[PDB]
Amino acid sequence: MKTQVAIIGAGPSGLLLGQLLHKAGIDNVILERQTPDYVLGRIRAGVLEQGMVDLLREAGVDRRMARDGLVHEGVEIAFAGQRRRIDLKRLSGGKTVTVYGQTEVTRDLMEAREACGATTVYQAAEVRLHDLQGERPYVTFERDGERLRLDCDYIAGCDGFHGISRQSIPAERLKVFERVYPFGWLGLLADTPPVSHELIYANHPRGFALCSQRSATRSQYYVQVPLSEKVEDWSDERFWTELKARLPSEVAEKLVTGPSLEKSIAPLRSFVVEPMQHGRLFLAGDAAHIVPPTGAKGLNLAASDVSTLYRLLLKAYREGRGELLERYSAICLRRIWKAERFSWWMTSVLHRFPDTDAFSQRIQQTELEYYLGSEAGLATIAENYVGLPYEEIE
Amino acid sequence: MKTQVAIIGAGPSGLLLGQLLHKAGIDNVILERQTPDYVLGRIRAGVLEQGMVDLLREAGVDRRMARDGLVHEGVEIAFAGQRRRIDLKRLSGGKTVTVYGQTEVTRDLMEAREACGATTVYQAAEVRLHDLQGERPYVTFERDGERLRLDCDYIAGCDGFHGISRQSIPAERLKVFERVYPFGWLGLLADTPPVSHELIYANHPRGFALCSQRSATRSQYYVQVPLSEKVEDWSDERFWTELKARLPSEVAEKLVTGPSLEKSIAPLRSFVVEPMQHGRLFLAGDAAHIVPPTGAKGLNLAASDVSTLYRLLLKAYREGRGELLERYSAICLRRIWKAERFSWWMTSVLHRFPDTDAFSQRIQQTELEYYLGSEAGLATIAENYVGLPYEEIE
């Protein structure tokens, strides 16, 4: 097989890059290890930044999101029994966030690709990358029982945190930055209506809790739990009971509990690799970084990497400016680190850390008190929650 | 589940460590991602060092190897039309090498374990490691559809180069050393008798070639090829024809060619991570290092790591000397680097490298000429080929 851009990964990153490239006229092939059903079988809500939403429009895959998505003009933080609203819309000009699951976004993208006939190979096992230093890079993989090879100009590794593209760059050439938090997020999806029309992040002595929603018809809730907790020791009622205890009574009082459609425990962590490229290979999304969910930034960073990479790819092909791709890492990395910072900040002011002393407890309470009570402070959060502006290339 | 030593990997490393531990009386559990058939389905010959052979005896799994293995007292190197024999037996005291496939060794080990009833979980998917810093480490994995947890004292990562145990140590705490050679080994297994009763390593202007044997009834041959070569462009006769061209006519003349039972291209590479442990996790075999096959050292290093780790584990449990495990890495690493050196040396004097000048060509020819023509020289190779002695712990 021969193509211009090889794309490892049919997740939101791969699909989005692939579609954008498709419409620009740049030939591309996506290699996915799993099956269409498997990929689409992973459930996950999503809070999308305006940038992410604009990028999907441009990709021509915004039809359904426009009909089913929920545009939130604000977000809430609760602590010390009170609820404080951060007017995202006003405090940032007019940017907003749109609630539309990742599963749905992925689904929407697979339909757009399946339709236009762009190339996608599923069940592409044992993917391996070659000649990243030369100018004739290629990929090998086994499908339906035979050995295949795919030649290209550049490979975009969008295979996520456990992918192989990052694992294909000489370790020495990369610097890894990471933090593993001492807790995870126990989540419960339900078809019960949301306790609020905007998300609610709650700080509480017993621990962090989150009131969100995957769609208009399903609620998404989270409570922080030690890393050694087993999801099977958390029956629905035990969850619902802990959730209420971490919320202001006014909220826990009007909350509609129900049987959990899905439950699980997701560990929190920060991960950043520098640089995010090697020769003809460029990393995007989870393949290059991980951010704790507290900032609602995983899918969104993935989108900005894609945007930057797409846009630089145009320049390169559509203008023979193949050098501008050297600036890929430095550009994304600047937005990635700012995203890591805001998510690290959100995590620190919202969660209960172990062995924390009286002073730390007071500083945390004061962080929330000052930021939520100041216009400058409320603005730092707003502009970050909606997502910082994408940096122009040239 | 609860056990003393958790073992990730049911390959030669895992199985060997597991059996040895079993006989010592230390409780152990092996978690394997694949199925028994799959593991056993990977075919691979093997040249075992005396140390490896002694370790299998001690493990009580030497019955079949003793009946089917071939003990070679010497090995040959060909170059410039001549054949030079390195009397391994004499030049090293009495140590020898035994030819018995890895597949067979693995098979022999699975039967010994299956029989004694020791614990082994196959199809243990999504393995993940936890609490490596504390003293109550544990492992999580999904089987038959449910989520399981395994507690232990120490985890031994024997999951190979693509395993997850190495990928579970904070990247920053590890230093990686590696070299990727500009060529691979195209191999052809046949049921035709071997052209020689001892292996034949051949240096030749056209490139390296190897005459070996998996068993008494099957031949194993290899020719070096550029990394971009596709196995499908190498029909049996094209292989046989190239093989003969790299051998002294006296050998190629009495060679019995036949249809290839198995063919493939294996890339060569050197890989070493320092240290080879993190808290309660210890790496063994391919999970910590890779050596080019030219030295016949992959399986053998794996065995010496296992020996060292087993022996230190005894001390720890059987004597409360749990500190001696801190010396695991430094001990193995000293033998690993010497093995990397000998394999790197063998590779350099036997293969054709690209863009090599007249001087390099002459030095290589002279390396072979001097070492094979000197008793001191023949000894450096002999003592290394059979395998250097295992370093005592205390």
Ligand SMILES: Cc1cc2nc3c(=O)[nH]c(=O)nc-3n(C[C@H](O)[C@H](O)[C@H](O)COP(=O)(O)OP(=O)(O)OC[C@H]3O[C@@H](n4cnc5c(N)ncnc54)[C@H](O)[C@@H]3O)c2cc1C
């Ligand atoms: C509780 C929680 C909530 C989250 N909520 C949000 C949210 O509200 N908003 C937000 O912005 N982010 C959110 N995220 C993050 C988001 O889920 C990820 O950042 C996103 O999935 C990354 O997409 P990706 O395409 O980069 O990788 P993935 O979605 O992981 O996709 C990678 C794809 O490539 C495949 N692949 C892997 N290995 C290979 C291989 N060897 N060969 C070929 N293909 C391979 C994979 O199987 C997969 O299909 C959340 C995370 C958590 C833990």
Ligand SMILES: Cc1cc2nc3c(=O)[nH]c(=O)nc-3n(C[C@H](O)[C@H](O)[C@H](O)COP(=O)(O)OP(=O)(O)OC[C@H]3O[C@@H](n4cnc5c(N)ncnc54)[C@H](O)[C@@H]3O)c2cc1C
């Ligand atoms: C051409 C060639 C010839 C060779 N010939 C020889 C020779 O003659 N002599 C010699 O000494 N060496 C030889 N070797 C090397 C030898 O094959 C390896 O070094 C050996 O297989 C390593 O064994 P291991 O148990 O460490 O790993 P492996 O055999 O790779 O086993 C690891 C096991 O763990 C499993 N695992 C992986 N991931 C997970 C996970 N996530 N969870 C659970 N389990 C997991 C794997 O599926 C596998 O079963 C050769 C190599 C090459 C390329």
Ligand SMILES: NC(=O)C1=CN([C@@H]2O[C@H](COP(=O)(O)OP(=O)(O)OC[C@H]3O[C@@H](n4cnc5c(N)ncnc54)[C@H](OP(=O)(O)O)[C@@H]3O)[C@@H](O)[C@H]2O)C=CC1
């Ligand atoms: N995902 C991850 O965690 C990591 C990915 N990588 C990257 O992946 C590649 C790893 O290199 P590598 O695994 O060697 O390449 P491959 O995975 O492609 O090698 C597989 C080929 O090696 C053969 N082989 C391996 N062992 C033996 C043996 N004992 N006897 C005979 N044949 C054997 C295979 O046989 P068969 O098919 O029979 O098994 C097969 O022909 C590199 O690209 C590296 O940069 C590196 C580290 C980690």
Ligand SMILES: NC(=O)C1=CN([C@@H]2O[C@H](COP(=O)(O)OP(=O)(O)OC[C@H]3O[C@@H](n4cnc5c(N)ncnc54)[C@H](OP(=O)(O)O)[C@@H]3O)[C@@H](O)[C@H]2O)C=CC1
């Ligand atoms: N092999 C390798 O290459 C590597 C291994 N590692 C190591 O592996 C672990 C990696 O950490 P991590 O992957 O997070 O742990 P896990 O692989 O165990 O995390 C899986 C859990 O995270 C959930 N999850 C992930 N994304 C989402 C999402 N968007 N929405 C809802 N739930 C989600 C999973 O859901 P579901 O089941 O639905 O997917 C599931 O509950 C660490 O031990 C690390 O040190 C690190 C790097 C590489």
